[PDB]
């Protein structure tokens, strides 16, 4: 053996909606996204 | 030249004249000039070669 | 000839590596709404030796969070230690970057995640025989429960 | 209508070498390098929520 | 080794000397059904 190293893998259930705003004016928009129910972001599941 | 396994090394004169530390810095795949007038020499190495 | 590998020189030298190349984060994955936990940032060398706390006063330490509205952070009276606080229920992703302020070279930790942390509705129901219903519920760990 | 000089953006790429990204002002330009699926992430650097 | 009077040279055999690893990332987060390939740096990449 010329070395050992250790990756920790966390695996984390349901889904939720996410937005930073929940009001909109007439004629305005907001972009919505999904996030997982533990907090899983589209970075880790979106692919 | 940002690509993993490229390496950058400032080259000093054998008379010790080029203290490149007084003219530039090299970090985060950037080059930066400092307060002083001068000349620096640099190698771009790759894969230890 | 056969034992020659074990004869060390009793005038033992010192060796100094000159250069943070990996980071560990020492903290808990769960905190209550309204309460706090500590985070310790461990910086290591190219050769896996830790730096001593007395060297962290020379390091550019930069924490990173996705959802600061659920889990907040401050730095403590020790540069190596940070104080976290939960604000509402949820999940948050956390990491820390350390940079050399002389060379702009940096290293970053693993990402980690921290949770912040039930009732039934209605509490009373009235029916006729042959009636049907479905129970509802609120608050807790809906991603872990 | 105007973001000021404090509106610094960052971007990350969940499968590296499928694309490259580059930001200028408030525009992220990307280029395809290999076939596949990737998430691009973009955030306000100093308010990452 | 070269002869500084005749320019004649001799060369040794080649030998190999070995010097004595890490993983990246050190922490990963996935969702169930997620895939990844571990990356690593150093060790002895011509004998390991």
Automatic annotation (TrEMBL), chain D:
It is found in: Nucleus membrane. Belongs to the NUP210 family. This is Nucleoporin 210. It comes from Dictyostelium discoideum (Social amoeba). The gene is nup210. The chain holds residues 1475 to 1523 of 1916 of the full protein.
